[PDB]
Amino acid sequence: SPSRVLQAEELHEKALDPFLLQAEFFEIPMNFVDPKEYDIPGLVRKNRYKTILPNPHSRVCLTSPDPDDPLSSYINANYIRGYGGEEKVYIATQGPIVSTVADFWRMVWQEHTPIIVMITNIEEMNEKCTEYWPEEQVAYDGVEITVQKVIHTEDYRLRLISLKSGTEERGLKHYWFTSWPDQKTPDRAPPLLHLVREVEEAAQQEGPHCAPIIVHCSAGIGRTGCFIATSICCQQLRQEGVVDILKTTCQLRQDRGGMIQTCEQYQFVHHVMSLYEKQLSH
């Protein structure tokens, strides 16, 4: 796997060299999936983008309501390895569309997902994501979703949610980040880093072997990949005192084609990690 281990000084300088960054970035294979892989009638209606498909080896398959129906069992989502290759730390998925809102909640229930991270600005709720949570309460497929509390913070809005299906009840935290920048300049890094830290602590609070954290945006690759890469690299920096964004990005691409879609995104991850290193070093 490609690797570029950055110590502090090289990290700071690397984040500020857009020519080297793009040279490096555009040699990472996208690892997109051949559409022939999901040539099933009606399956196209379940995808936002025809070219952005879940790699089959890591695809999340839905086991209800009909596991013998390839359409019913399909969602555009992949399991994503975390730091050190830990399996199923995240699920990367597309923002639900009207026809997949119920599927999304089926995934949440099936995977026991305790945390969702939504990276969509309020302005983008017309294009990039269908509002899939209730004002108070809604049910899809025997799982009742109840919003118990909304907590507005500067860098995100956190919904505390209860999921009930049958006799059993589970908690869920929905983190909605609304500060995704147009220009991915270093001044815009702190809120993303803060989100990353908040979510990683929430995850530790779930105890051993936390169920997959769902992360989405519109396609489930760009901003989603930035968030996951940053999360992984924060653990790497703390443990190893270095970051290897190149290796991490390559690992993510193995799990889901296109993770970190643009060079601006790739650079932004470097800005965030440079920021975090500075914070740690002081």
Side-chain angles (χ1 to χ4, degrees), residues 1-8 10-35 37-38 40-49 51-125 129-134 137-163 165-166 168 170-277 279-282:
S1 194
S3 172
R4 175 51 48 183
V5 172
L6 305 172
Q7 302 250 80
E10 192 181 356
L11 173 60
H12 305 325
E13 194 186 18
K14 180 61 157 297
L16 298 175
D17 186 351
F19 283 102
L20 178 56
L21 283 170
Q22 68 78 40
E24 184 173 286
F25 182 71
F26 290 109
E27 293 205 72
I28 308 175
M30 220 47 160
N31 199 33
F32 283 143
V33 183
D34 184 339
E37 190 72 43
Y38 301 107
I40 299 164
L43 198 141
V44 287
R45 296 176 79 80
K46 293 204 171 294
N47 290 317
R48 286 181 177 280
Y49 308 97
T51 65
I52 315 302
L53 304 171
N55 301 63
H57 78 290
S58 51
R59 182 170 66 101
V60 183
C61 296
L62 298 172
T63 60
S64 325
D66 196 349
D68 300 359
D69 174 337
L71 193 53
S72 183
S73 308
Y74 178 85
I75 187 160
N76 197 322
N78 292 91
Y79 297 116
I80 308 296
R81 290 170 295 161
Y83 176 64
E86 187 179 15
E87 288 283 331
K88 303 183 168 184
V89 174
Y90 313 92
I91 287 162
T93 190
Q94 74 178 12
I97 54 169
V98 171
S99 61
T100 71
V101 165
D103 297 341
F104 179 87
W105 286 114
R106 282 199 282 121
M107 184 166 66
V108 171
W109 185 262
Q110 163 183 300
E111 299 291 330
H112 296 65
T113 290
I115 297 162
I116 300 167
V117 186
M118 171 166 175
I119 313 163
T120 294
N121 295 337
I122 286 94
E123 26 277 321
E124 305 175 311
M125 291 299 291
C129 196
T130 300
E131 186 176 74
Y132 55 84
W133 60 92
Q137 200 172 67
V138 67
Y140 297 99
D141 293 309
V143 295
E144 184 188 68
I145 299 106
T146 310
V147 179
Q148 298 182 309
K149 188 169 186 175
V150 186
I151 299 161
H152 304 282
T153 76
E154 192 164 314
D155 300 328
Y156 57 82
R157 28 262 245 170
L158 170 57
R159 287 167 161 78
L160 307 184
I161 293 168
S162 183
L163 285 42
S165 199
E168 69 163 302
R170 307 168 180 173
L172 167 71
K173 295 179 187 181
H174 183 262
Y175 287 90
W176 181 14
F177 183 80
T178 54
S179 298
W180 190 264
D182 169 43
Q183 301 314 305
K184 281 71 172 172
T185 52
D187 58 312
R188 311 302 301 276
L192 185 63
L193 179 61
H194 182 222
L195 177 74
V196 166
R197 294 282 299 102
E198 204 63 52
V199 169
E200 78 177 325
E201 296 315 301
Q204 289 193 30
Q205 290 158 23
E206 298 294 329
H209 303 295
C210 188
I213 296 159
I214 290 166
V215 186
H216 74 88
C217 41
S218 183
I221 59 169
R223 303 181 187 182
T224 297
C226 288
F227 176 85
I228 295 173
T230 304
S231 297
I232 289 167
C233 289
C234 281
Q235 285 191 232
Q236 190 177 20
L237 185 57
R238 290 195 302 267
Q239 182 174 318
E240 306 175 32
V242 301
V243 305
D244 192 343
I245 295 161
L246 175 55
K247 186 174 181 212
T248 298
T249 299
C250 292
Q251 184 181 287
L252 291 172
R253 296 277 175 87
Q254 291 175 334
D255 294 338
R256 182 171 169 85
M259 290 288 278
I260 309 186
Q261 191 178 12
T262 69
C263 192
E264 292 84 3
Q265 284 163 3
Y266 196 61
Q267 181 163 28
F268 195 46
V269 173
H270 286 74
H271 290 320
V272 173
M273 292 317 303
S274 179
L275 177 62
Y276 189 43
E277 195 285 327
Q279 292 188 349
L280 290 180
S281 66
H282 301 298

Short mmCIF file of all heavy atoms in Angstrom, two decimals, residues 61-83:
data_model
loop_
_atom_site.label_atom_id
_atom_site.label_comp_id
_atom_site.label_asym_id
_atom_site.label_seq_id
_atom_site.Cartn_x
_atom_site.Cartn_y
_atom_site.Cartn_z
N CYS A 61 -25.41 -5.33 3.19
CA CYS A 61 -26.62 -5.93 2.62
C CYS A 61 -27.73 -5.93 3.67
O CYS A 61 -27.47 -6.24 4.83
CB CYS A 61 -26.35 -7.35 2.15
SG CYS A 61 -25.15 -7.44 0.79
N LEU A 62 -28.94 -5.56 3.26
CA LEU A 62 -30.06 -5.45 4.20
C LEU A 62 -30.77 -6.79 4.23
O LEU A 62 -31.12 -7.33 3.19
CB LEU A 62 -31.02 -4.34 3.77
CG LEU A 62 -30.43 -2.92 3.74
CD1 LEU A 62 -31.43 -1.96 3.11
CD2 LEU A 62 -30.04 -2.47 5.10
N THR A 63 -30.96 -7.34 5.43
CA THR A 63 -31.52 -8.70 5.56
C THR A 63 -33.04 -8.76 5.74
O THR A 63 -33.63 -9.84 5.67
CB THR A 63 -30.86 -9.46 6.72
OG1 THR A 63 -31.09 -8.76 7.95
CG2 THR A 63 -29.36 -9.54 6.47
N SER A 64 -33.66 -7.60 5.98
CA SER A 64 -35.12 -7.49 6.01
C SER A 64 -35.51 -6.42 4.99
O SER A 64 -34.69 -5.55 4.69
CB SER A 64 -35.60 -7.08 7.40
OG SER A 64 -34.79 -7.65 8.42
N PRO A 65 -36.75 -6.46 4.47
CA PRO A 65 -37.83 -7.41 4.71
C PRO A 65 -37.70 -8.69 3.88
O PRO A 65 -38.29 -9.71 4.24
CB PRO A 65 -39.07 -6.65 4.26
CG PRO A 65 -38.57 -5.79 3.13
CD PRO A 65 -37.16 -5.41 3.51
N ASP A 66 -36.96 -8.63 2.77
CA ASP A 66 -36.80 -9.81 1.91
C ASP A 66 -35.35 -10.03 1.52
O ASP A 66 -34.86 -9.43 0.55
CB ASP A 66 -37.64 -9.70 0.65
CG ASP A 66 -37.79 -11.05 -0.05
OD1 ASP A 66 -37.07 -12.00 0.32
OD2 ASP A 66 -38.65 -11.15 -0.96
N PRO A 67 -34.65 -10.91 2.26
CA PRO A 67 -33.25 -11.12 1.96
C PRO A 67 -33.05 -11.88 0.65
O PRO A 67 -31.99 -11.79 0.06
CB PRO A 67 -32.75 -11.92 3.17
CG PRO A 67 -33.93 -12.63 3.67
CD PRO A 67 -35.12 -11.77 3.36
N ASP A 68 -34.09 -12.58 0.18
CA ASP A 68 -34.05 -13.27 -1.11
C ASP A 68 -34.35 -12.37 -2.31
O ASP A 68 -34.45 -12.87 -3.43
CB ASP A 68 -35.03 -14.45 -1.13
CG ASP A 68 -34.73 -15.48 -0.06
OD1 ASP A 68 -33.75 -15.29 0.70
OD2 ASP A 68 -35.48 -16.47 0.03
N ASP A 69 -34.53 -11.08 -2.10
CA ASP A 69 -34.79 -10.14 -3.19
C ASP A 69 -33.59 -9.19 -3.29
O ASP A 69 -33.32 -8.44 -2.34
CB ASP A 69 -36.07 -9.36 -2.88
CG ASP A 69 -36.35 -8.27 -3.89
OD1 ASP A 69 -35.42 -7.79 -4.56
OD2 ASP A 69 -37.52 -7.86 -4.00
N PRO A 70 -32.87 -9.20 -4.43
CA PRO A 70 -31.65 -8.39 -4.51
C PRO A 70 -31.91 -6.88 -4.48
O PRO A 70 -31.02 -6.11 -4.13
CB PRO A 70 -31.02 -8.82 -5.84
CG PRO A 70 -32.14 -9.29 -6.65
CD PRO A 70 -33.13 -9.92 -5.69
N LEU A 71 -33.12 -6.48 -4.86
CA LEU A 71 -33.48 -5.06 -4.84
C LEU A 71 -33.74 -4.65 -3.40
O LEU A 71 -33.16 -3.68 -2.91
CB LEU A 71 -34.69 -4.81 -5.74
CG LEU A 71 -35.09 -3.39 -6.13
CD1 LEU A 71 -33.92 -2.63 -6.73
CD2 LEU A 71 -36.23 -3.46 -7.12
N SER A 72 -34.59 -5.41 -2.71
CA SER A 72 -34.92 -5.14 -1.30
C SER A 72 -33.69 -5.12 -0.38
O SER A 72 -33.64 -4.38 0.60
CB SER A 72 -35.92 -6.17 -0.76
OG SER A 72 -36.28 -5.85 0.57
N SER A 73 -32.70 -5.94 -0.70
CA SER A 73 -31.51 -6.08 0.14
C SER A 73 -30.41 -5.07 -0.18
O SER A 73 -29.39 -5.03 0.51
CB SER A 73 -30.96 -7.49 -0.02
OG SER A 73 -32.00 -8.46 0.21
N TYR A 74 -30.60 -4.27 -1.23
CA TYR A 74 -29.59 -3.31 -1.67
C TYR A 74 -29.69 -1.96 -0.95
O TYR A 74 -30.78 -1.37 -0.84
CB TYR A 74 -29.67 -3.09 -3.18
CG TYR A 74 -28.68 -2.06 -3.68
CD1 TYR A 74 -27.37 -2.41 -3.98
CD2 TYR A 74 -29.04 -0.72 -3.78
CE1 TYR A 74 -26.44 -1.45 -4.39
CE2 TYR A 74 -28.12 0.23 -4.20
CZ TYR A 74 -26.82 -0.15 -4.51
OH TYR A 74 -25.91 0.79 -4.93
N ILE A 75 -28.55 -1.49 -0.46
CA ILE A 75 -28.34 -0.08 -0.10
C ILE A 75 -26.93 0.33 -0.54
O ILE A 75 -25.98 -0.47 -0.51
CB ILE A 75 -28.55 0.16 1.41
CG1 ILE A 75 -28.52 1.65 1.78
CG2 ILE A 75 -27.53 -0.59 2.27
CD1 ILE A 75 -29.16 1.94 3.09
N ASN A 76 -26.82 1.59 -0.94
CA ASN A 76 -25.52 2.14 -1.32
C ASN A 76 -24.73 2.52 -0.07
O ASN A 76 -24.79 3.66 0.41
CB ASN A 76 -25.70 3.36 -2.23
CG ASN A 76 -24.43 3.72 -2.97
OD1 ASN A 76 -23.32 3.63 -2.42
ND2 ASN A 76 -24.56 4.14 -4.23
N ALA A 77 -24.00 1.53 0.45
CA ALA A 77 -23.24 1.65 1.69
C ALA A 77 -22.15 0.59 1.74
O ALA A 77 -22.33 -0.50 1.23
CB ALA A 77 -24.14 1.47 2.88
N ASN A 78 -21.03 0.94 2.39
CA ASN A 78 -19.94 -0.01 2.63
C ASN A 78 -19.43 0.09 4.05
O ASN A 78 -19.34 1.19 4.61
CB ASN A 78 -18.75 0.32 1.73
CG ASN A 78 -19.03 0.05 0.28
OD1 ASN A 78 -19.49 0.94 -0.42
ND2 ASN A 78 -18.79 -1.19 -0.17
N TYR A 79 -19.07 -1.07 4.59
CA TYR A 79 -18.28 -1.14 5.82
C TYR A 79 -16.91 -0.53 5.55
O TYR A 79 -16.32 -0.77 4.48
CB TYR A 79 -18.10 -2.59 6.26
CG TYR A 79 -19.40 -3.28 6.60
CD1 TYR A 79 -19.85 -4.36 5.84
CD2 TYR A 79 -20.17 -2.86 7.69
CE1 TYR A 79 -21.04 -5.01 6.17
CE2 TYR A 79 -21.39 -3.51 8.02
CZ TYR A 79 -21.80 -4.58 7.26
OH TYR A 79 -22.98 -5.22 7.56
N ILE A 80 -16.40 0.22 6.53
CA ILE A 80 -15.12 0.91 6.41
C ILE A 80 -14.28 0.53 7.62
O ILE A 80 -14.73 0.61 8.76
CB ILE A 80 -15.29 2.44 6.39
CG1 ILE A 80 -16.31 2.87 5.33
CG2 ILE A 80 -13.95 3.15 6.22
CD1 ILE A 80 -15.95 2.59 3.84
N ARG A 81 -13.06 0.08 7.36
CA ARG A 81 -12.11 -0.24 8.41
C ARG A 81 -11.65 1.04 9.09
O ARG A 81 -11.58 2.12 8.47
CB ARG A 81 -10.91 -0.98 7.83
CG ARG A 81 -11.22 -2.40 7.37
CD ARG A 81 -10.06 -2.94 6.60
NE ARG A 81 -9.86 -2.20 5.35
CZ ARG A 81 -8.73 -2.19 4.65
NH1 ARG A 81 -7.68 -2.89 5.07
NH2 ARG A 81 -8.64 -1.46 3.54
N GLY A 82 -11.34 0.95 10.36
CA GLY A 82 -10.83 2.10 11.11
C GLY A 82 -9.32 2.04 11.29
O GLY A 82 -8.59 1.37 10.53
N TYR A 83 -8.84 2.79 12.26
CA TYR A 83 -7.40 2.83 12.58
C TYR A 83 -6.86 1.43 12.85
O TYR A 83 -7.50 0.65 13.55
CB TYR A 83 -7.18 3.71 13.82
CG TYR A 83 -5.76 3.72 14.28
CD1 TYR A 83 -4.74 4.25 13.48
CD2 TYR A 83 -5.40 3.16 15.48
CE1 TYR A 83 -3.40 4.22 13.88
CE2 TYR A 83 -4.08 3.14 15.91
CZ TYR A 83 -3.08 3.68 15.10
OH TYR A 83 -1.77 3.66 15.54
#
